[PDB]
Design a protein around this ligand. Structure first.
Ligand SMILES: OC[C@H]1O[C@@H](O[C@H]2[C@@H](OC[C@H]3O[C@@H](O[C@H]4[C@H](O)[C@@H](O)[C@H](O)O[C@@H]4CO[C@H]4OC[C@@H](O)[C@H](O)[C@H]4O)[C@H](O)[C@@H](O)[C@@H]3O)OC[C@@H](O)[C@@H]2O)[C@H](O)[C@@H](O)[C@H]1O
Ligand SMILES: [Cl-]
Length: 747
């Protein structure tokens, strides 16, 4: 069992590229800020460099669900302490969650398993915070759970947790009762202490709790959590996203008719006075002027009658931030209509940290580029600096350092504030053997990028075609400037858009071919996997819906392949352009006529990742032919159910494989430049070798393996993508599901 020290760095996107449902300011120590994501763990802010530091990269393979951070609380009495409620899904895709605790601001963690599931990537994840510390008695914490598990509490600083059985409402709202995703109760929505009802060293007596129940959503305890009642006279019909208590004694609540993050077509904002019990509707828009929920809610701690709310979601032409300086009596919009369709703006967008955020499109008043945002469920004002705002969108963290310019006739300068954040899901990677780019990525949501300087954010979004998610990308090994990517075009927005993109200049410029695979009745929606012949004279497209198709006309025409079942994984030989390989349900296939016909080989023992009790990200199939060697294929994948799991090698074009006996488990395989004095390329694998899960390199065709990551650089379920660099020995590129792309070299 060996290991080699490596330097692990992020491939920089500048924006992060993912959803940030929560930003949490410490109420005591200035500039102590945390950010939580739905699939990529959490971050802590570094004021000296205006950047975020991940406090989650020790999360590994088995405990991968810890990177779903449903809630986070930072301790106002001892700011060194921070807690997280983690777990990713509450349906059959995940196991139970946990509460994690740290005494060093997230540098190290201890964990307490929960007897139920946590939903860091489930609906309503931007509602919160659902984990809070008693600001007068910091050994006390409360957690508002999902799925009907109700209210839970700790009195030993989060080490043990007990159900608050006296809480009367576990939730009634269900987002998708007829789907397998989100068919459970959303549950509790947020918890808020009233610090004035305690003193330092004495438990806070008044606690407010929001619940996802349109008929009765806001609750209070006035005896320290023993007895609970619904607030009299509260509004009904909506779902409270946040509840924030001003020092003036007013509780402000944003409401949407959904829990988000994607919906919300009606909304309200209310304020409740804790002394009189009076409810006041302070919705910025009502009636037909309102077509969106209200999500983000930010109080100004230094000016307790100043607050802001964000739409969730207005969509067109953009979202809206509303600001009030008189407790919600009147609101000022961050933009207004001038002479239609011209608009006026109280803000300026700065995306110089991630220029690709313009999606390659010029901005107009009715179609801004970049937009102010979307999925704006969390809006924050720095409690120690009224001029600092931060908010999360579906793509990045935005912020300002001159917010009060709003009040004095100026413009709020909004800029990307996501430095150090990487949150994309990586669906594919290629390291081109030639040209200025060593890495082209296939990403969810933001398509992917052709990188040059891995420390500089890309300037160009992938267009013509333009889509959200690239599912696969490949290049012609013998003509690496020829390159093909497939995703899923939005043909309701652009009915002429295609789900396949082709490049002749190594991914600097793409174009869309004339046709797509079609079975006469229906044209493919896209996605699936693509493979490009060694010479670039043909393309193989294993579509997601209508099976395997090939093109010998660079996408001008597609013909269905025979003998290879729909859903098969595919790969091209890197030397013989006539040779394609396929795999489906334990059977390996080979084509020798450019992908027109496939025949099964006798390769035996391959896993049929068909088993019943497998979570969506638990198993994988990684199959790649070797550059420069015809018929040399490596194969990684499987699962422990079937006891078919590891790394195989064929040198006879897949007629038979040898399973490496020194590799207990393997999920991905990739190739990089040969070590000095070696002729065969180095192997890179995500695997379990000699009892250790991690990333391994072999310079001797798999005879011996060295671990090139470590326990501080694991990145949760890393079964997404891996490749070496054909020009740089020792270099590895590692995809993740929520931490973007990493690259690493020996120290
Ligand atoms: O019944 C299935 C149901 O799922 C619906 O999608 C929801 C579901 O998706 C699961 C996937 O979530 C990804 O993480 C998302 C994250 O939730 C989003 O907040 C953010 O915007 O994007 C990331 C990444 O997603 C992109 O990259 C990976 C690719 O698989 C995705 O298709 C792509 O969008 C995880 O990375 C995935 O591992 C996970 O499978 O749960 C989270 C919800 O946010 C989704 O909406 C789907 O809409 C529906 O049609 C149906 O399939
Ligand atoms: Cl797009």
């Amino acid at each position: 069992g060996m290991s080699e020290p490596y330097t692990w760095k992020s491939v920089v996107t500048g924006a992060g590229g993912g959803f940030v449902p929560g930003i949490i300011f410490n109420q005591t120590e200035p500039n102590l800020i945390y950010a939580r994501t739905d699939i990529g763990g959490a971050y802590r802010w570094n004021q000296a460099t205006s950047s975020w530091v991940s406090i989650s990269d020790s999360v590994g393979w088995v405990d991968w669900n810890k990177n779903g951070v449903d809630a986070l609380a930072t301790d106002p009495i001892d700011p060194n302490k921070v807690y997280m409620a983690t777990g990713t899904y509450t349906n059959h895709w995940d196991n139970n969650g946990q509460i994690m605790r740290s005494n060093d601001r997230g540098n190290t963690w201890q964990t307490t398993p929960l007897p139920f599931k946590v939903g860091g990537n489930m609906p309503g994840r931007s509602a919160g915070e659902r984990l809070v510390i008693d600001p007068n008695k910091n050994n006390i914490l409360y957690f508002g759970a999902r799925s009907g598990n109700g209210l839970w509490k700790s009195i030993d600083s989060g080490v043990t947790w007990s159900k608050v059985t006296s809480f009367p409402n576990v939730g009634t709202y269900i987002q998708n009762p007829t789907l397998d995703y989100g068919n459970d109760l959303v549950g509790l929505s947020w918890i808020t202490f009233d610090k004035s009802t305690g003193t330092l060293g004495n438990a806070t007596q008044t606690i407010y709790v929001g619940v996802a129940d349109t008929a009765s959503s806001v609750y209070r305890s006035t005896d320290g959590g023993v007895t609970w009642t619904a607030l009299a006279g509260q509004p009904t019909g909506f779902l409270p996203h946040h509840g924030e208590l001003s020092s003036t004694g007013d509780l402000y609540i944003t409401y949407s008719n959904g829990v988000g993050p994607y919906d919300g077509s009606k909304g309200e904002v209310w304020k409740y006075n804790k002394t009189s019990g009076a409810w006041t509707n302070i919705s910025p828009t009502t009636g037909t002027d309102n077509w969106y929920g209200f999500g983000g809610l930010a109080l100004d701690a230094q000016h307790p009658n100043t607050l802001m709310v964000s739409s969730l979601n207005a969509w067109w032409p953009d979202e809206v931030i509303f600001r009030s300086t008189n407790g919600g009596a009147t609101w000022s919009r961050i933009w207004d209509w001038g002479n239609y369709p011209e608009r006026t703006y109280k803000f300026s967008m700065d995306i110089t940290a991630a220029p690709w955020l313009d999606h390659g499109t010029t901005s107009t008043s009715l179609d801004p580029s970049p937009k102010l945002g979307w999925m704006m469920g969390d809006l924050e004002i720095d409690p120690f600096n009224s001029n600092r705002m931060m908010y999360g969108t579906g793509a990045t963290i935005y912020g300002s350092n001159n917010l009060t310019s709003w009040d004095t006739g100026g413009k709020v300068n909004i800029s990307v504030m996501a430095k150090g954040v990487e949150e994309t899901a990586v669906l594919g990677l290629i390291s081109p053997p030639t040209g200025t780019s060593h890495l082209i990525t296939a990403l969810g949501d933001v398509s992917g990028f052709r990188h040059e300087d891995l420390s500089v954010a890309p300037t160009k979004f992938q267009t013509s075609p333009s889509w959200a998610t690239t599912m696969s990308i490949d290049y012609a090994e013998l003509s690496p400037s020829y390159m093909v990517r497939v995703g899923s075009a939005d043909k309701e927005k652009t009915p002429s858009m295609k789900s396949i993109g082709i490049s002749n200049d190594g991914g600097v410029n793409w174009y869309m071919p004339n046709s797509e695979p079609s079975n006469g009745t229906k044209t493919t929606v896209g996605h699936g996997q693509v493979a490009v012949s060694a010479s670039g004279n043909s393309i193989l497209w294993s579509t997601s819906d209508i099976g395997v198709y090939y093109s010998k006309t660079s996408g001008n025409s597609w013909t269905a392949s025979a003998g290879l079942p729909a859903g098969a994984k595919i790969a091209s030989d890197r030397v013989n352009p006539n040779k394609y390989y396929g795999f489906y349900a334990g059977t390996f296939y080979v084509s020798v006529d450019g992908g027109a016909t496939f025949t099964a080989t006798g390769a035996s023992g391959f896993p049929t990742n068909n088993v019943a009790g497998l979570q969506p990200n638990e198993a994988q199939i990684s199959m790649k032919a070797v550059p420069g060697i015809e018929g040399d294929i490596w194969f990684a994948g499987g699962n422990t159910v079937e006891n078919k799991y590891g790394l195989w090698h064929s040198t006879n074009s897949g007629a038979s494989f040898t399973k490496l006996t020194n590799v207990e488990e393997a999920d991905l395989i990739g190739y990089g430049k040969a070590a000095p004095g070696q002729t065969y390329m180095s192997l890179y694998t995500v695997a379990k070798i000699d009892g250790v899960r991690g990333v391994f390199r072999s310079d001797d065709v798999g005879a011996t393996w060295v671990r090139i990551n470590d326990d501080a650089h694991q990145y949760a379920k890393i079964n997404m993508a891996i490749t070496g660099d054909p020009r740089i020995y020792g270099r590895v590129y590692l995809g993740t599901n929520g931490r973007g792309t990493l690259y690493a070299d020996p120290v």
